[PDB]
Paper text:
The TEC family kinase, BTK (Bruton’s tyrosine kinase) is best known as the target of ibrutinib (IMBRUVICA), the first-in-class covalent kinase active site inhibitor used to treat chronic lymphocytic leukemia, mantle cell lymphoma, Waldenström’s macroglobulinemia, and chronic graft-versus-host disease. The TEC and SRC kinases share the SH3–SH2–kinase domain arrangement (the ‘Src module’). In contrast, BTK contains an extended N-terminal region (PHTH–PRR) consisting of the phospholipid-binding Pleckstrin homology (PH) domain followed by a Tec homology (TH) domain and a long linker housing two proline-rich regions (PRR). Membrane-induced dimerization activates BTK and we present here a crystal structure of an activation loop swapped BTK kinase domain dimer that likely represents the conformational state leading to trans-autophosphorylation. Together, these data provide the first structural elucidation of full-length BTK and allow a deeper understanding of allosteric control over the BTK kinase domain during distinct stages of activation.
Numbering used by the authors:
A (entry chain A): 392 to 545, 560 to 659
B (entry chain B): 392 to 405, 407 to 545, 558 to 659
The structure:
Amino acid sequence: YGSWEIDPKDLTFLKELGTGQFGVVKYGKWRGQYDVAIKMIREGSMSEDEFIEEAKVMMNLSHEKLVQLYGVCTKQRPIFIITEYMANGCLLNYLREMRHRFQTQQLLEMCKDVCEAMEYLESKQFLHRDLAARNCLVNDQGVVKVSDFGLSRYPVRWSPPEVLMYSKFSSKSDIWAFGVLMWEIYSLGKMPYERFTNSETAEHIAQGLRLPRPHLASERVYTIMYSCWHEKADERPSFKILLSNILDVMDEES
Amino acid sequence: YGSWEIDPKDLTFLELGTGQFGVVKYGKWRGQYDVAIKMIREGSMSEDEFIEEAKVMMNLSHEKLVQLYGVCTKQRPIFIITEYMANGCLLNYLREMRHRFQTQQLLEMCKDVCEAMEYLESKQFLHRDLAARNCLVNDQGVVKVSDFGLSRYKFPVRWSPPEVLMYSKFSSKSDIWAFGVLMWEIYSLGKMPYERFTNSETAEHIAQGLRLPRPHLASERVYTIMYSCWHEKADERPSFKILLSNILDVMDEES
Ligand SMILES: Cc1nc(Nc2ncc(C(=O)Nc3c(C)cccc3Cl)s2)cc(N2CCN(CCO)CC2)n1
Ligand SMILES: Cc1nc(Nc2ncc(C(=O)Nc3c(C)cccc3Cl)s2)cc(N2CCN(CCO)CC2)n1
């Protein structure tokens, strides 16, 4: 893959952070000077072609609020993926572990960080398959960033109208999820619809039920997350507009 | 994978076509049984993808479904053996025999595809690409669908919008629309849907509420079936259990 291929002997496995479906992440050090995260992909988790597309996306996309790629080790099995290390780890556990210790003005900065990354992927026609607090990482300075792994891109004469319409306004799925994310941040890791099941939630949202307003979220902040929860997808805002609305509130409140 | 394991030497590679995941050839088992062989590429699928595909191939069976004869998992490229379809694709079969069909044969074909889908519907399986080009015909003129590359019905209910949850509840209604157009291909003798419109014009043509015109070979009652498959509201469309329910009724009426 060129310069992206790194030397394995320069790595050093030290600790374990977690395990996923497409491998296991392990904490290490690059040349014993910088902290990095290393993911060990399983032999049969993904196909060859699937890795070329996934990799091709990680090298061509770059944003300050996206998990930076340090390199990969495709010259061995299992293959590695070296990236920057996030000291604080997951955002969900971060909101619950360090709960109510950061003031409200910091909560909105977390939404801005995620909105900045999504706005970038939006400009590149990329969709987050699972946008939620559990899929966001926090670094030492409290910056929230999303990942590039597992991203998506965006029969005509045999497909129904429901499929055609979705193929043109599918980007609005990441907007609804983002709205529920702000709810998780301002609720400090509260699970959406705690008093409802999966079947219930699907029925309540269909009837118009929306998440309450976090007590730590101002009435204007609620307008942002609530703007993302519009029945008509085309009536929902874009990540560029949401970023402007978030920045607008930050200036008026801070 | 057990008894499903076939000896690559027992099969002889006597070519039929090629797909994304590999190429399909023609052969015979022990010089006595006819079957088709699929040589999947090395990097097209993953180990987990195959195990799921196979697990679905070996656990499903239906007369109108492509029967699986076996696989060769101790070989690279991995092989998948199935029954041989003398007449091959349905679209080419409708165009090569356009002058050699009866009105009862056309409706019989539609049943052969509906009977298969009805079985898939009961097992919660979905055909991602249901069309005449993905259907095969054996020597006796019986149509059969394939179960390779199917999908079942993750979506986080708590973070998904309504259009996604509503899609997961009416996912089988999408194949109904495709089935309705399939019947048009049959009674139209292989004509391309919206042959006089482009991909962008077809999408708008459906948005305006217009649909395919009735083929002259289809009767008023048969067209009502395929037309019922094309309803703006997915919930208002019938089910494959109901389509077969009707197709048989029009058969007895016109037979
Ligand atoms: C799960 C976890 N992640 C951490 N930081 C990460 N940085 C980079 C990671 C990563 O997975 N990148 C990546 C991606 C995104 C895709 C493909 C490939 C790769 Cl390599 S993960 C830290 C952490 N700890 C901190 C919070 N607790 C401290 C209390 O002791 C405990 C746990 N936990
Ligand atoms: C493309 C083609 N298929 C033919 N029969 C097949 N039987 C089994 C096939 C197969 O694909 N199974 C399968 C599936 C479904 C999934 C995964 C894996 C597998 Cl293995 S295909 C015959 C044929 N010929 C007949 C019609 N023409 C001569 C007229 O004189 C020429 C062409 N052409």
